[PDB]
Design a protein around this ligand. Structure first.
Ligand SMILES: COC(=O)c1c(O)cccc1OC/C=C/c1cccc(-c2onc(C(=O)O)c2CO)c1
Length: 298
């Protein structure tokens, strides 16, 4: 019936209003640690901070801060860690979190340079022979291989705890065609990407929460996590009718502020979910159609 509401809202162009209702009702919690003078240079955006109750703490004794939130979806049984695009001084902190939280995958939904502006540090190696060493957190990162597609790239990295010489394989999923404050070209390409992450096991419970990020870790990241959670709930009981997307987004906003930044991203979330439902309900051949429609082939 979410599709009914879609026709309704669309029919009466009330997405801006619907979206504003969610903002008026969104949770609001203190972000004291994020605002401490010492963590000023650890935040990319003044207006984007993690709540204290759900922030990820680095296991270091010096300063345990990092702009990241653990979005823990109870009913859905899935957790994601949303974070901002790392800054030049926080890449070490970024991989420390990945290691400490035991994440297997990292989903980047933005590009390093957007609209002629640096939206994220180049926190992973681009060439196999030039690995990166993060002196502050004592970690080493090596590009092992990368599969480049038309609008997204999947990299295989090796992360090594230089202190224990223990190594882990990290899968890096990079969506390169999602405009800042924009929406995927189509839900086909989006779902194709999402399912690719799902195929990798990165979202399994046997692994730490997958780390999701865009430039701030709220706009495009929210859109991604919302569609995934909604499709998962729908899957648990095979009942599209029992999935209240607006209510799910509100449940997510209790863990991090401003998930989904525009009324169009919200509208897209609906589209993505509705289309994704086709696969969840027994039509496994739609996944191939998405792959085709996406045109991932160079
Ligand atoms: C629309 O606003 C809200 O929903 C909201 C709210 O209801 C309550 C409290 C705070 C809120 O937003 C705070 C952040 C503004 C804000 C400021 C600067 C950048 C971004 C941003 O968001 N997503 C991205 C991306 O990389 O895709 C970016 C990168 O440019 C958001």
């Amino acid at each position: 019936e979410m599709e009914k509401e879609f026709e309704q809202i669309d029919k009466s162009g009330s997405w801006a209003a619907i979206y504003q209702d969610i903002r008026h009702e969104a949770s609001d919690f203190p972000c004291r640690v994020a605002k401490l003078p010492k963590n000023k240079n650890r935040n990319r955006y003044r207006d984007v901070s993690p709540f204290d109750h759900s922030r990820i703490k680095l296991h270091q004794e010096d300063n345990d801060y990092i702009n990241a939130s653990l979005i823990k979806m109870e009913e859905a049984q899935r957790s994601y860690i949303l974070t901002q695009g790392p800054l030049p001084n926080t890449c070490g902190h970024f991989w420390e979190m990945v290691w400490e939280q035991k994440s297997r995958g990292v989903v980047m939904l933005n590009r390093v340079m957007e609209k002629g502006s640096l939206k994220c540090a180049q926190y992973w190696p681009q060439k196999e022979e030039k690995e990166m060493i993060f002196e502050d957190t004592n970690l080493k990162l090596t590009l092992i291989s990368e599969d480049i597609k038309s609008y997204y790239t999947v990299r295989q990295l090796e992360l090594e705890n230089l202190t224990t010489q223990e190594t882990r394989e990290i899968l890096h999923f990079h969506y390169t065609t999602w405009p800042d404050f924009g929406v995927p070209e189509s839900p086909a390409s989006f779902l194709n990407f999402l399912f690719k992450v799902r195929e990798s096991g990165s979202l399994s419970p046997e692994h730490g929460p997958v780390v999701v990020h865009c430039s701030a870790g709220i706009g495009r990241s929210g859109t991604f996590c919302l569609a995934d959670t909604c499709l998962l709930l729908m899957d648990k009981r095979k009942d599209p009718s029992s999935v209240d997307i607006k209510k799910v987004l509100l449940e997510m906003r209790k863990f991090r502020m401003g998930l989904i930044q525009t009324a169009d991203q919200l509208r897209f979330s609906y589209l993505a979910v509705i289309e994704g439902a086709k696969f969840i309900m027994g039509d496994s051949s739609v996944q191939d159609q998405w792959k085709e429609l996406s045109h991932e082939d160079l």
